[PDB]
């Protein structure tokens, strides 16, 4: 009955839900959430890695600043006063 046009884009994608369904979309949403979690985990890891890079040069004494820009947004802002 109902129409499951193509798109587009997306749009129609949700129209298919009606066609063959209960389910379908919820599983896709869960997959999307998992993807978001992977994206979030990557970012968290990246920030920790950015710390790992700024480490050593975390004690004191001139030496960046310097490479702190170009410098993955902190780097700086960080070198200074």
């Amino acid at each position: 009955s109902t129409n499951g046009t193509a798109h587009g884009h997306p749009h129609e994608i949700i129209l298919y839900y009606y066609e063959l369904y209960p389910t379908m979309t919820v599983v896709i949403v869960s997959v999307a959430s998992f993807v978001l979690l992977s994206m979030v985990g990557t970012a968290v890891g990246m920030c920790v890695c950015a710390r790992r890079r700024c480490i050593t040069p975390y004690e004191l004494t001139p030496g960046a600043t310097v490479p702190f820009l170009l410098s993955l947004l902190c780097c700086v802002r960080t070198t200074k006063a």
Binding site: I55, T56, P57, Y58, E59, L60, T61, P62, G63
Partner: protein
């Protein structure tokens, strides 16, 4: 510049005001026996077995400098004269015991050259295991078989 770490009312090691940071070996149990220093926030570093923080403005005049410059010859330390050569600091065996960690090895102009962590006994003389400055960055030299003081 030198301050003592106490644990259950007992001196475990030392803390030192070098450069603009406040150092103390990470392995040392206790808390610096100085109000101003004790309440600080230290950043541990297990690679270097170091644990630094920043010197309060009112004590910064009390720090001890440092230097990467260390030519073969004799250096000064609380128990006498250390000898540097072959990229190794040594002393007459017996002149350094557990509880000497944290003590700086000065040169003749007062610049701190290294900080003792422990020593390996190799007979007549003991090769010290120290924290020393490289081109700009900190480093740690630990002779084979060191006994952490």
């Amino acid at each position: 510049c030198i301050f003592e770490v106490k644990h259950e009312g007992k001196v475990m090691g030392y803390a030192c005001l070098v450069g603009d940071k406040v150092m103390k070996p990470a392995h040392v149990k206790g808390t610096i026996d100085n109000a101003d220093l004790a309440k600080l926030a230290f950043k541990r570093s297990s690679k270097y077995d170091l644990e630094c923080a920043q010197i309060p403005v009112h004590m910064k005049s009390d720090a001890s400098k440092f230097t990467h410059e260390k030519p073969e010859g004799y250096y000064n330390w609380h128990h006498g004269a250390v000898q540097y050569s072959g990229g190794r600091f040594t002393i007459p065996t017996g002149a350094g015991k557990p509880g000497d960690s944290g003590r700086p090895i000065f040169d003749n102009k007062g610049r701190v050259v290294a900080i003792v962590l422990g020593g390996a006994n190799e007979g007549a003389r003991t090769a010290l295991s120290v924290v020393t400055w490289n081109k700009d960055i900190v480093t740690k030299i630990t002779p084979e078989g060191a006994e952490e003081w």
